[PDB]
Amino acid sequence: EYSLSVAVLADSEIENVTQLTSVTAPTGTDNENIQKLLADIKSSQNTDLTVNQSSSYLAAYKSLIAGETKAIVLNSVFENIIELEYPDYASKIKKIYTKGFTKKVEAPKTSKNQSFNIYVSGIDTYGPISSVSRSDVNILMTVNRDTKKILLTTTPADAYVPIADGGNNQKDKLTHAGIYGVDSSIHTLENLYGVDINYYVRLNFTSFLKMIDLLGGVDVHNDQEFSALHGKFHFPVGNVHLDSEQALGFVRERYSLADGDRDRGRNQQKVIVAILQKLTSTEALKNYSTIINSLQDSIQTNVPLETMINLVNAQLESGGNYKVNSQDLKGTGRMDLPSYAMPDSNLYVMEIDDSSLAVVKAAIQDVMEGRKLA
Ligand SMILES: CC(C)=CCC/C(C)=C\CC/C(C)=C\CC/C(C)=C\CC/C(C)=C\CC/C(C)=C\CC/C(C)=C\CC/C(C)=C\COP(=O)(O)O
Hints:
By secondary structure, the protein is α+β, with helices and mostly antiparallel strands.
């Protein structure tokens, strides 16, 4: 659910598209959508516009505010990209023609064998799940139902990788993929790790809170004393029970941890294991429908109902615990590499360590294939 519009400056005398002869747009990277809009304009308004190609939607916007063009095409998805460098962009423009588009995100891929991959996207925002934002949590869960093994692979938010789809396969921090959509994030990680991602789950701060509450909190073993959210929550060494708000702090704190983002990644993994322990309780399995009802409006997923039912009932009958292992893609922080989405800013990114990538890829394959980890 997105839209393309013809936009002009807020104070432009232009009121409707029939007054235009041309429009500036990135036909180099969004030609299909753009051409649909132009065909729709020619049909309902009998107006044929020539296109002044721009290198991107950001570039088109710059041209507009610079007075170098009268009108641009704007794909709503990319308004969120423009906002990264121009937070007040919305107030600078008006829209004089709008076309709604619709697309389903990733279709689910059913695995032909005992193993599947689920991508967990954690969005940096409160409120309705439909809110567009970057994906600061990017965890792949490789599950093998035969060996009863799970592998959690964390990819840091700042990982500098080719971003698929809207990212135009250009390098940027992984978290930006989330802005283009869950599709972009999924395809980005499929390409990086060379595996099919069967399903995804997408949730934000508000979704996470409801889930923890619903489950009655979660229990973890904390390895190092730390505090989160400017000292609001304190976590001692030892077994800790986390309510919704504590758990959210627990998975967010980074800077004060001995190993920074890597330790935060491990804390997130601890919480996932704890959630899984609650979700595979007999009470939870028996009452899965209530859990679906309770979380459906705040958590997006393409896992089919039929699949959930199979997974739940299989666990109900067979019982038995999954063993969980974890890993994280390693790299080196840098300030001198360009961000495709934010070309004018110096950003911190993590340049991937190639030897680590090889190891991470091999481990995913091992668990999928039922081989022991190195
Ligand atoms: C289905 C069933 C009952 C059994 C199936 C059999 C088994 C054992 C496994 C099958 C797997 C299945 C079906 C489901 C697994 C899913 C599962 C158990 C748990 C899912 C956990 C989920 C959905 C989310 C966890 C994500 C998590 C830990 C945190 C979310 C992160 C969020 C929302 C925000 C983080 C943002 C962040 C890192 C920092 C905040 O930003 P700043 O403050 O600016 O720095």
